Write a protein that binds this ligand. Structure first.
Ligand SMILES: *[C@@H](CS(C)(=O)=O)[C@H](Cc1ccc(CN)cc1)NC(=O)CNC(=O)[C@H](CC(C)C)NC(=O)[C@H](Cc1ccccc1)N=[N+]=[N-]
Ligand SMILES: [Cl-]
Ligand SMILES: [Mg+2]
Ligand SMILES: [Mg+2]
Ligand SMILES: [Mg+2]
Ligand SMILES: [Mg+2]
Lengths: 226, 196, 244, 243, 250, 231, 241, 204
């Protein structure tokens, strides 16, 4: 996995690749690692996939109820504090590594959360097996007061560095842009640099190639009736 | 990590590096290890980042609730709450915390809480992996009732050496000054302190 | 202390009756009549809704007839909210039995379980009993078609035809007069509707007032079908039997 | 009617009659007082000598909490002890966590909330004691008085029990005649006098005076009982004033 | 310091009445009029903002509440009881449904869960019933639009249109005359405002009336873009201005 | 009247009727006397029989080697409270290698009795106790009432007709307090005191129960022919 | 007639214990008032020290709940302190869990939900208090939110509580009918306090000394109570114009 | 020792044009010993199909669990559960055992009755959802199935072509795994008809 987050002039942006792996095999070629928490708060996940998914969903559910209760827009610090306190409780056994970013009445925010419950504040961050490839790019090119156009370029470049150079990371680039005073725009498959090339042959078989012992109709309906 | 708190004439100064490592990878090179549990009671964190954050967050909560009921807590009271958490959960924590604070009555006070959960009130304290390299230096150069400028230089030179020799320490030298005048944040960059 | 305010819901009267059970039965006597009639080839459940308003959305409404599983249904008389608590328990018990034995729960076993729950509220806990009487209509491969009733006491009994709710005295006399053992579902449908039509406190019996259901072993290829009648279908069967 | 039969029931007035009935038990008890002085507090109490068989100086009524707080009470004596036992647990857990000994206002609320909790349910009875307590903390001397309702305020002088009106009148004179303040040793003498004057309400049986004090100069801010020569000096001063 | 009320406070009287439920219904009768009308392409729920003081800011007191993005609720009776029911209803929609199935519950099932909560206050130890009747309007994919009433007993009924509280008898007669199965949402809003005017004494405007709809999906109110399947909340509370506009065409 | 249904209810004059009714059970109980000098402390108890076939109900219980009590009222409640005292005496010895002070024992009984008077469901204890003991500050005599009130005394009596014995001790105070290093004369004074509370019946050999504790005397109970000496 | 002793419905649909808790509210015979400025929220309350033996510095019905939130109570002090301690605990726990300071209106709602529970659950009695919360909220600005024994709560432009609340309420109503705004258009809190005191004097028809009042002021990022000398300065300014 | 490979077996699912296919082998073993050649791994709850590989006791348990849950769903909702909703239910139910998981590799397959859209999904043992457009694989020969599917598959196959592709993917994968085979079953699922076919394969 390669996930990153960086801040720009009046916003924060998250990036992520789309490859989920089981050991050395590619389980998923188009998985969304950018998780929804609130309309304007998003979370990138690395580590154990089910853990990263479940924890963001749970905090997202609790954030929604909290928002209803208080009649206020949820804050990124609330998501951060709830995530870290949950992750800390489980002592790293929930192996979720997250980059949380969003906009709220306080402003725009960017945090990282580790599975053991530690949190960081940063202007640019990266997590997962491709974090070093991504951080190399962010360290070379990040500056203050980036425009949105520069920020999307840098974020996607950081994710790409991971895609190419890290075996853990691959396939496509997802991005989410959270800008102050605007709707957050979620850009799944922002880049598609790894479309499979056309195959040499078609392996569509002649019908009747497979030997069959029995056939039957399955009754899937309720009550066959009189 | 390299951290220290030093009492002086007008109050106390906390000092820290900014490096957080996961093995040999620097996970964060601009970490803020000086953390606020009350207006003029701060702490320096070393050991498990998860654990020291979790503790500091609980202490901040306790002192906030103390303040609602009984007014401003002493620095001793803050150190006691840190100690209580560290000591009672010593089997599940890796936390080395220096607590520093300013009362008007007591002036500058420094308390160090190492791994065990013991408390030690000191004129100054050093801690973290990089502190080993500056026990000699700090013992020879520390004086009581220094000025603000002398204490800033003492911390700057000390942590400069700690950073130089410890790979686990590095980045910027952050400091927080606690006096009657208020709370002042200072930062010192590599180009400044490396040439000392 | 608190003792002062305790109604003591689980005590005997000097005569040896359970006050709250008796008063719950009095409550149930005012509820809309429900009739169950068991035939050789199926069971009928008919029931009268209580709250005639023109603005009640009848097609999505369910106050009387509930489904427990594919083989067993109930007709309710009393507090609907109380009944739904018990119904969800019964639905779970059926699925627990199915998970354990890999066979659908026998009708009597489900009925006993519910009746045992109701009983508990009359003997311990200090809570009010459930103000509900059920007619259970069901099928299994042991006894075939079965009708039961349970009441707030937790007593249950088996029936060929039975009524609960309002005017049960009048209703049970009329059923006892016209029921026969060789009867069929179509005849039982007619008997159920005729009985309600005479015992109703309303001026006339109409489709918007009724909930109606049949359990038939007259599904395709010897299976059992539960039919909860839609409003239009109740209106058709009222015209067919000649009541409207 | 029936509003007075159960604790925590509001009458149509807005009153909890059971608490007001607990006050009657307090009013029935012996006289106890508290005097705030310059750098501390003085507590004194009337102990009715029911019989010659009572051992003198043994049935001690005033109780210490932690090392710096004194508590005295009038009414049902066991209820007072139960409250002090709680106070000691509160003062211990405060010191355990926060290191510093419990401040007097902090301590006052700990008792206050606990007594108030016994007016919230019908399963408990209100406390049949008014408790006068106080001591010296980091912010100086404090004297409090705590009623069966959970109500408490800070006081210059406090009094409760059967001789409270008599005592209160005497305390009010001291407040008027000493605006700059009263010394610790003066307050001991005046406390003795006030208990002696307040004994006209319990005049049938003779009594035994008991005094305690916390003072920053005289006891190092610790609670101590007034004993021996200092006690006898206060009894002599009190005996002189009544005659 | 014990809860000793482990016995029912609601019990059957000799006549078969559950007194506390009847008395809760009497409290609902005293409460301010609220109503619900179901159209073909929507539902409307409405009530009077009976302001307890003119110094009070009646905007802060929401009588009409969002439970889920596609389900809304209004009440008549005791406001505090309603407020806590809305809190529990919102939560139960997550715990007993969204966290299991990854989608919001349909109207009838959320209603069933609220009904259950109210039923339990009618039988559990040491509690009185809730002193509210709720009108819950909602939409879901397989049931379409729906309107439900929920009483202190825990009983619930689906309605085409109804009213509860103060002037409900007169209001229900008014709705019977006006309702048909071919109403558009705007027609239902119009009828709602007419019906509600009869039970209101004083001022009748957008500031003294609360009105919400379950209608079309509002992608503008969603807050984000990039997921085609999430089209936005069907619940929408009408503004003070939006109400006043329709009161001119009244 | 209306305020005597349970212990949790104050009357309009600030009285706890259930506690006062428990106090009444003590007055119905058989007389027992307690008294002490500087060296020794003595319990004397008039035991009560059901009829001529029955045994005489035991009135005195040992709590430790240096402490014990006599009872008047509900004997099962005395058993509970004495057992509690035994445990507290034992806890002091095991944990602190320390004999429990008699004053502290009284404080413990007060607080145990108090909890029953403030909480619902419970009832007050229906028994009065006279605790004697010899500790690090010499001889002691306590009187426990189930209201909670414990009182350190030179001498006292509780039970039916106890006022006669109590008046005698009040007169004799100056004499019996001086009976130091003479256990037999102190017991005599206790036996003479309890005699003032007798009517019709007199002190026989299986009627009388005496106990003593002192300087070099463990708490020991005398019954039967052991007390014939003092009749 | 046990429907009047515990919190269950009377035949009329009433909770008599809630109604009698409202009557306990006025047992102190103290009137409170709260108003909003531009940058502030001011709360004033009558202070009556009838006994000369009382330490007047400890007689207060205004509480500092959090740094941002203040709370004035109308009702007996034991219930006031019960409510104060809980509100403090709730405000601190909120900050710990959710990472930002508890808003005034959210605390008011929380305390009101707690009050509701006492009206539904039999074993708990209602607290005989009306809680007026004040802050300068970081989202909503100057805020007044009031809770009662029924569990009802609502926001206010201004409010008054006590025996003579109707007189104070109508006085304030009439002022805001003139100005046609939801607040006191005044820059400094000092002048908003002067307004509050002046309009209480007019409404109640009584003059005040420095020891007859008790004042609380909410500004951005702190709530604080005025000393007797701070109030005296306020009273001098009122008299001088 | 490794629970997921004691009993063995495989499930593969594929999408086609207005259809889905789900297939499984029939082997149940105790490591090397073959025990049963009739152990089907594909179940159905209404029109939603669930294949489950892994530890056989959990395969059976989860089938009984999802039958239970979908039956109660149907009674309350008054409609059969859809593939997308069921997928979330499987995920929920697996993750609630996060720290004592069922050792399984479930595969959902079905057609949404309202939208008509073909749907397949796979999960790890703790409920992470892989919602593939093309195919899902599971079991002890998952590597082999990935290799077969990835080359053999092409989108928008007609039901009777899709049958040949999924069958050849299963069979040839199974023959390279010691713990899979011993017979196979292929379900071809269309919006309102489902055909079940048992395949002839080598019995070693
Ligand atoms: C990259 C993280 S990494 C290896 O640190 O670079 C991605 C992040 C990610 C992918 C997908 C989502 C979608 N919700 C979110 C985040 N993570 C992975 O590739 C990690 N992969 C997995 O966790 C597997 C996902 C399956 C869908 C293939 N799951 C497993 O391998 C589990 C792990 C596990 C099992 C038992 C106990 C603990 C952990 N089982 N196996 N084999
Ligand atoms: Cl709440
Ligand atoms: Mg270095
Ligand atoms: Mg109550
Ligand atoms: Mg093989
Ligand atoms: Mg083989």
């Amino acid at each position: 996995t390669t996930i990153a987050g960086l801040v720009f002039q009046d916003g924060v942006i998250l990036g992520a690749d789309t490859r989920a792996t089981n050991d050395s095999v590619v389980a998923d070629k188009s998985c969304e690692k950018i998780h929804f928490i609130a309309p304007k708060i998003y979370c990138c996940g690395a580590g154990v996939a089910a853990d990263a998914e479940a924890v963001t969903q749970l905090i997202g559910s609790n954030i929604e109820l909290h928002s209803l209760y208080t009649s206020r827009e949820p804050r990124v610090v609330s998501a951060l504090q709830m995530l870290k306190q949950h992750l800390f409780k489980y002592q790293g056994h929930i192996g979720a590594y997250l980059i949380v970013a969003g906009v709220d009445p306080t402003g725009s925010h960017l945090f990282s959360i580790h599975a053991h419950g530690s949190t960081d504040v940063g202007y640019y961050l990266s997590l997962g097996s491709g974090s070093l490839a991504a951080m190399a790019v962010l360290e070379s090119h990040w500056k203050q007061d980036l425009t949105k156009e520069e920020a999307i370029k840098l974020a996607s470049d950081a994710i790409q560095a991971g895609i190419w150079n890290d075996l853990g990371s691959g396939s496509n680039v997802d991005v989410c842009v959270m800008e102050i005073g605007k709707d957050a725009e979620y850009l799944r498959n922002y880049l598609t640099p790894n479309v499979r090339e056309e195959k040499q042959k078609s392996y569509k078989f002649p019908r009747g190639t497979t030997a069959v012992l029995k056939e039957s109709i399955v009754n899937i309906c309720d009550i066959q009736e009189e | 990590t390299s951290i220290m708190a030093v009492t002086f004439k007008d109050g106390v100064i906390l000092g820290a590096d900014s490096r957080t490592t996961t093995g040999a990878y620097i996970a964060n090179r601009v970490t803020d290890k000086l953390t606020r549990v009350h207006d003029k009671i701060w702490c320096c964190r070393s050991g498990s980042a998860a654990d020291t954050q979790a503790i500091a967050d609980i202490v901040q909560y306790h002192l906030e609730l103390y303040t609602s009921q009984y007014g401003t807590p002493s620095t001793e009271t803050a150190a006691s709450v840190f100690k209580e958490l560290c000591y009672e959960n010593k089997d599940n924590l890796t936390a080395g915390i220096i607590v520093a604070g300013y009362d008007d009555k007591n002036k500058g006070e420094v308390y160090t809480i190492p791994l065990g959960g013991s408390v030690h009130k000191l004129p100054y304290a050093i801690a973290g992996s990089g502190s080993t390299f500056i026990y000699g230096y700090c013992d020879k150069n520390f004086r009581e009732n220094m000025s603000k400028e002398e204490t800033v230089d003492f911390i700057k030179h000390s942590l400069s050496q700690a950073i130089k020799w410890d790979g686990s320490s590095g980045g910027v030298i952050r400091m927080v000054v606690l006096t009657a005048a208020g709370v002042e944040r200072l930062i010192f960059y590599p180009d400044e302190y490396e040439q000392l | 202390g608190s003792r002062r305010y305790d109604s003591r819901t689980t005590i005997f009267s000097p005569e040896g009756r359970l006050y709250q059970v008796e008063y719950a039965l009095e409550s149930i006597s005012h509820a809309g009549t429900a009739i169950g009639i068991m035939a050789s080839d199926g069971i009928v459940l008919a029931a009268e809704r209580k709250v005639t308003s023109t603005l009640l959305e009848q097609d999505t409404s369910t106050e009387k007839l509930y489904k427990l599983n594919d083989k067993i249904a109930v007709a309710v008389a009393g507090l609907t909210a109380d009944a739904e608590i018990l119904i969800n328990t019964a639905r779970i018990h059926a699925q627990n039995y199915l998970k354990t034995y890999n066979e659908d729960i026998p009708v009597e076993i489900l009925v006993r379980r519910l009746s045992d729950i109701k009983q508990g509220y009359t003997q311990h806990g200090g809570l009010r009993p459930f103000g509900v009487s059920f007619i259970y209509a069901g099928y299994d491969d042991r006894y075939g078609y079965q009708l039961y009733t349970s009441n707030p006491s937790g007593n249950y009994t088996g029936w060929k035809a039975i009524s609960v709710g309002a005017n049960t005295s009048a209703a049970q006399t009329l059923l006892q007069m016209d029921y026969k053992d060789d009867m069929k579902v179509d005849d039982a449908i007619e008997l159920a509707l005729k009985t309600l039509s005479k015992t109703t406190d309303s001026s006339a019996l109409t489709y918007d007032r009724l909930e109606f259901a049949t359990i038939r072993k007259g599904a395709n290829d010897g299976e059992v079908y539960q039919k909860i009648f839609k409003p239009q279908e109740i209106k058709d069967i009222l015209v067919k039997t000649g009541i409207t | 009617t029936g509003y007075d039969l159960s604790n925590s029931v509001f009458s149509p007035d807005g009153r909890n009659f059971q608490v007001e009935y607990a006050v009657k038990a307090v009013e029935n008890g012996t006289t106890s007082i508290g005097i705030k002085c310059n750098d501390g507090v003085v507590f004194a109490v009337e102990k009715l000598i029911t019989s010659k068989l009572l051992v003198p100086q043994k049935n001690v009524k005033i109780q210490v909490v932690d090392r710096h707080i004194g508590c005295v009470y009038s009414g049902l004596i066991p209820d007072g002890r139960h409250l002090v036992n709680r106070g000691r647990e509160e003062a211990a857990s405060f010191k355990k966590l926060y290191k510093t000994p419990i401040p007097i206002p902090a301590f006052a609320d700990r008792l206050g909330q606990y007594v108030q909790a016994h007016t919230l349910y019908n399963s408990v009875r209100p406390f049949g004691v008014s408790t006068i307590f106080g001591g010296v903390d980091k912010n100086g001397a404090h004297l409090y008085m705590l009623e069966p309702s959970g109500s408490y305020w800070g006081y210059k002088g406090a009094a409760t029990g059967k001789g409270r009106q008599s005592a209160k009148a005497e305390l009010e004179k001291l407040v008027d005649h000493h605006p700059e303040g009263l010394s610790a040793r003066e307050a001991v003498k005046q406390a003795a006098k006030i208990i002696y004057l307040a004994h006209e309400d319990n005049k049938e049986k003779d009594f035994e005076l008991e005094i305690s004090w916390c003072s920053l100069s005289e006891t190092n801010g610790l609670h101590k009982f007034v004993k021996g020569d200092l006690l006898q000096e206060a009894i002599d001063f009190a005996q002189k004033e009544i005659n | 310091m014990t809860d000793r009320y482990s016995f029912s406070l609601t019990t059957f009287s000799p006549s078969g009445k559950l007194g506390q439920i009847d008395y809760a219904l009497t409290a609902v009768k005293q409460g301010v009029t609220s109503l619900g009308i179901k159209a073909t392409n929507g539902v409307v729920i409405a009530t009077e903002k009976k302001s307890s003081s003119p110094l009070a800011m009646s905007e802060t007191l929401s009588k009409v509440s969002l439970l889920t993005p596609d389900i809304g609720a209004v009440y008549s009776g005791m406001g505090p009881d309603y407020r806590v029911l809305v809190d529990k209803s919102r939560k139960v929609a997550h715990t007993s449904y969204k966290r299991i199935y990854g989608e919001y519950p349909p109207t009838k099932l959320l209603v069933s869960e609220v009904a259950k909560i109210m039923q339990e206050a009618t039988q559990s130890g040491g509690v009185r019933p809730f002193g509210v009747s709720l009108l819950i309007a909602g939409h879901d994919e397989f049931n379409g639009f729906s309107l439900y009433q929920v009483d202190p007993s825990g009983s619930y009924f689906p309605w085409k249109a109804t009213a509860i509280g103060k002037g409900s008898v007169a209001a229900k007669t008014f709705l019977e005359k006006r309702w048909n199965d071919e109403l558009e949402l705007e027609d239902a809003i119009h009828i709602a405002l007419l019906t509600l005017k009869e039970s209101v004494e004083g001022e009748f405007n957008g500031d003294t009336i609360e009105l919400a709809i379950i209608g079309d999906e509002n992608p503008d109110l969603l807050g984000y873009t990039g997921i085609p399947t999430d089209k936005g909340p069907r619940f929408r509370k009408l503004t003070s201005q939006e109400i006043n506009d329709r009161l001119e065409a009244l | 009247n209306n305020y005597d249904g349970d212990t949790v209810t104050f009357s309009p004059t600030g009285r706890l009727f259930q506690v006062e009714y428990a106090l009444e059970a003590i007055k119905q109980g058989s007389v027992t006397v307690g008294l002490r000098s500087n060296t020794h402390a003595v319990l004397v108890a008039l035991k009560r029989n059901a009829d001529e076939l029955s045994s005489y109900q035991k009135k005195i219980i040992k709590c430790d080697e240096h402490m014990g009590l006599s009872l008047a009222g509900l004997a099962p409640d005395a058993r509970v409270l004495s057992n509690y005292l035994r445990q507290q005496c034992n806890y002091s010895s095991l944990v602190f290698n320390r004999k429990l002070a008699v004053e502290r024992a009284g404080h413990l009984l007060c607080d145990k009795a108090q909890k029953n008077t403030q909480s619902y469901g419970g009832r007050p204890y229906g028994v009065g106790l006279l605790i004697i003991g010899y500790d690090k500050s010499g001889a002691h005599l306590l009187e426990f009432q189930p209201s909670g009130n414990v009182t350190e005394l030179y001498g006292t009596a509780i039970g039916a007709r106890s006022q006669g014995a109590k008046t005698y001790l009040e007169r004799t105070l100056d004499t019996f307090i001086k009976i130091d290093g003479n256990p037999d004369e102190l017991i005599k004074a206790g036996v003479e005191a309890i005699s003032q509370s007798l009517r019709d019946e007199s002190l026989t050999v299986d009627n009388l129960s005496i106990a003593i504790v002192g300087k070099d005397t463990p708490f020991t109970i005398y019954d039967g022919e052991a007390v014939a000496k003092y009749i | 007639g046990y429907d009047r002793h515990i919190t269950i419905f009377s035949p009329e649909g009433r909770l008599y214990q809630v109604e009698y808790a409202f009557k306990a509210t006025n047992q102190t015979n103290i009137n409170s008032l709260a108003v909003r400025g531009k940058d502030c929220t001011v709360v004033i309350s009558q202070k009556k020290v009838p006994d000369k033996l009382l330490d007047p510095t400890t007689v207060s019905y205004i509480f500092c709940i959090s740094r941002t939130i203040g709370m004035v109570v109308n009702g007996p002090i034991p219930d006031a302190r019960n409510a104060a301690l809980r509100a403090k605990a709730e405000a601190a726990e909120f900050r710990y869990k959710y990472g930002y300071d508890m808003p005034c209106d959210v605390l008011a709602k929380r305390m009101a939900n707690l009050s509701q529970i006492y009206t539904q659950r039999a074993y708990m009695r209602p607290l005989g208090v009306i809680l007026t919360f004040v802050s300068v909220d970081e989202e909503l600005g100057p805020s007044i939110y009031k809770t009662d024994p029924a569990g009802y709560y609502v926001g206010y432009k201004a409010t008054a509580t006590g025996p003579k609340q109707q007189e104070i309420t109508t006085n304030l109503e009439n002022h805001f009918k003139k100005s046609k705004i939801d607040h006191i258009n005044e820059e400094s809190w000092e002048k908003v306090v002067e307004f509050a005191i002046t309009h209480m004097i007019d409404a109640l028809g009584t003059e005040f000394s420095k020891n007859d009042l008790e004042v609380g002021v909410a500004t951005k990022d702190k709530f604080f109570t005025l000393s007797a000398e701070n109030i005296e300065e306020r009273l001098v300014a009122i008299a001088e114009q | 020792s490794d629970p997921s490979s004691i009993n063995g077996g495989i499930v593969v699912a594929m999408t086609g044009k207005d259809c889905v296919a789900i297939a499984c082998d029939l082997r149940l073993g105790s490591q090397s010993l073959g025990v049963s050649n009739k152990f089907e791994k594909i179940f159905h709850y209404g029109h939603v199909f669930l294949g489950i590989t892994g530890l056989a006791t959990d395969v059976t348990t989860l089938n009984e669990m999802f039958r239970y849950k979908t039956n109660l769903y149907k009674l309350k909702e008054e409609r059969a559960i859809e593939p997308e909703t069921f997928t979330q239910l499987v995920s929920s139910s697996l993750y609630e055992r996060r720290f004592g998981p069922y050792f399984v590799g479930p595969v959902v397959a079905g057609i949404n009755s309202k939208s008509g859209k073909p749907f397949i999904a796979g999960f790890d043992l703790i409920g992470c959802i892989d919602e593939a457009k093309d195919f899902i694989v599971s079991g002890t020969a998952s590597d082999q199935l990935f290799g077969m599917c990835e080359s053999l598959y092409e989108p928008n196959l007609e039901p009777e072509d899709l049958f040949e592709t999924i069958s050849q993917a299963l069979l040839n994968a199974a023959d390279r795994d010691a713990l899979s085979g011993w017979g196979a079953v292929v379900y071809i699922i269309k919006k309102d008809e489902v055909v079940k076919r048992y395949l002839k394969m080598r019995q070693d």
